[PDB]
């Protein structure tokens, strides 16, 4: 049947959660129970744009949805989510989150996030496995897939002490890894108490929020995590060349959450063993300068080589690179065709090379205040004069 006229309906809906609509895409992988109302097959990625779309595909009591609520409180982001079914032992659970090609021919687990593009036109720039990246096997599958998919995987340590976070961060010297160790303590409405949360999804919602307002070259390293009430351990940002808990974990290349009932993500070093790739600003800018360069020069794979093919790409590359210097992503790029490697034997194979040097904007990691108390202006005032 239908209805004509206006209905009113008493229905409880919980206090809307406005966020900036972001363009970044996030690859998510966690556990859920495939039931009746959960309209998702387990090892099949689904595109998510809403908390309703997360609770219609997955259960509202699932661990997918708690990770998706963790992102939608900060950014209205696009989430390619893969609902790995639960398992008994943590050896078989970590094996199911990693997954693989162990189907007939399908891709399961984290490996289904490589299917995010060509299923939904959403190639995941952020990889998150909440609660499962604490195992060293999953966090290596996060690593090798962030290298393929050209993304930043957001890890997390255990619930344990600082030294269990430092010793777990020495297992990785990879550029694409970004560990956030202290878990989030979020207030649960059902139990009416503070539930723990693995804080990887809260980083990824803020990592994608920074792309909206501040741009992908900005660091997420002082921005505000929303929807949280505290951390699992109190993290201590103090000064004085001390053993501060925020400074201990930053020197192990781990971001923390530092103030005000768990208020701000703090670090900006990635887990790299190379000082050229220390900041995630360096890793994210180089990753997304090219994704704007590539998506924008899709005409260079067709369009058979004429005389001014190599010139029309350089002036096309310089034009989509002065748009990046304009908005502040780079500072004084340099684009030119490679004069030493553009042979005609390379050109018969279809190969033609270019050089796209640029300089990234540095983050203001350590402002230094040199404060002094003087008695210089003790006579300039406080006198008859």
């Amino acid at each position: 049947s239908f209805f004509h006229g206006v209905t009113v309906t008493n229905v409880d809906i919980g206090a809307r959660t406005i966020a900036l609509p972001a363009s970044s895409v996030i690859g998510l992988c966690d556990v859920f129970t495939p039931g009746a109302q959960a309209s998702a097959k387990p090892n099949v990625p689904v595109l998510l744009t809403s908390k309703k779309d997360a609770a219609a595909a997955f259960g509202i009591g699932s661990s997918i949805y708690l990770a998706c609520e963790a992102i939608y409180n900060r950014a209205q982001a696009v989430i390619v989510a893969v609902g790995v079914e639960t398992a008994e032992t943590p050896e078989a659970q970590a094996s199911a989150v990693i997954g693989g090609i162990s189907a007939a021919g399908e891709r399961t687990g984290l490996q289904a996030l490589l299917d995010g593009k060509s299923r939904f036109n959403a190639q995941p720039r952020l990889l998150v496995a909440p609660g499962h990246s604490a195992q060293q096997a999953v966090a290596t599958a996060m690593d090798g897939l962030a290298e393929k998919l050209r993304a930043i995987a957001i890890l997390d340590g255990p619930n344990s002490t600082d030294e269990a976070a430092v010793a777990y961060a020495k297992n990785f010297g990879s550029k694409r890894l970004f560990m956030v160790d202290p878990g989030v303590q979020v207030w649960d409405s059902a139990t009416n108490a503070a539930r723990n949360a693995p804080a990887s999804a809260y980083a990824a919602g803020l990592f994608a929020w920074t792309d909206a307002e501040y741009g992908f070259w900005s660091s997420p390293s002082n921005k505000e995590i929303k929807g949280v009430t505290g951390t699992s351990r109190p993290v201590e940002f103090l000064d004085g060349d001390e053993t501060c808990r925020a400074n201990l974990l930053n020197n192990a290349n781990i971001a923390t959450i530092i103030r005000d009932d768990g208020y701000r993500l703090w670090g900006n070093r990635t887990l790299s063993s190379d000082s050229k790739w220390a900041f995630v600003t360096r890793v994210r800018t180089m990753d997304l300068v090219m994704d704007a360069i590539l998506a924008g020069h899709k005409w260079a794979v067709d369009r058979g080589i004429t005389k001014t093919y190599v010139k029309d790409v350089t002036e096309g590359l310089r034009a989509f690179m002065r748009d990046l210097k304009n908005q502040g992503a780079v500072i004084n790029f340099e684009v030119y065709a490679d004069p030493d490697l553009n042979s005609a034997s390379q050109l018969a194979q279809g190969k033609v090379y270019w050089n796209i040097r640029f300089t990234d904007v540095p983050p203001a990691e350590n402002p230094n205040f040199r404060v002094e108390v003087t008695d210089q202006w003790l006579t300039e005032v406080l006198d008859v004069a």
Partner: protein, 167 residues
């Protein structure tokens, strides 16, 4: 010097060559915006610079040529790219290329009078938002108004105002 003169022109709009139907090109007239400056203790003005004028490059085709008609009036300004090329000959036979890559808004399409026996000429005009002139493969001009750059021999003349404005 050697007596040198243009003999041939060409046009590339979006990589497509107009090597059959562009009878006339016009590079943008680079004019600096002078103000005649007469002040104390002097009998004549002295013409301080105030920046560049607005650049328009115009060109004509006289076939149909959808490959230039489809760039009029897009929402994306500075999306008309385009390369004006010229070959300057010289008496001894050393042809010198003059290539002017430019970018902007195709701002007017002027199909003229259509008489029957007379050649009909579509006159176009672009509103230049980027302009680089290379002569003999060497950068002479490079003008980008937004991201204020005025390079004259590869030397950016606006590095003075760039540090003053904190750009």
């Amino acid at each position: 010097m050697i007596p040198q003169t243009l003999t041939n022109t060409n046009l590339f709009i979006d990589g497509v060559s107009f090597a059959g139907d562009v009878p006339s090109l016009t590079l943008p007239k680079l004019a600096v915006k002078t103000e005649q400056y007469r002040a104390g203790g002097m009998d004549a003005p002295v013409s301080i610079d105030m920046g560049l004028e607005a650049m328009e490059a115009k060109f004509s085709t006289n076939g149909a040529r959808r490959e230039a008609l489809n760039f009029f009036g897009l929402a994306d300004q500075s999306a008309f790219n385009g390369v004006f090329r010229g070959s300057f000959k010289g008496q001894k036979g050393a042809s010198v290329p003059v290539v002017a890559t430019l970018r902007g808004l195709l701002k007017e399409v002027d199909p003229g009078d259509w008489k029957a026996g007379e050649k009909a000429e579509f006159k176009y005009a672009v509103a230049v938002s980027y302009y680089k002139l290379e002569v003999d493969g060497r950068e002479v001009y490079e003008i980008d108004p937004v991201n204020g750059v005025r390079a004259i021999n590869g030397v950016d003349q606006l590095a003075g105002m760039r540090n003053d404005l904190g750009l």
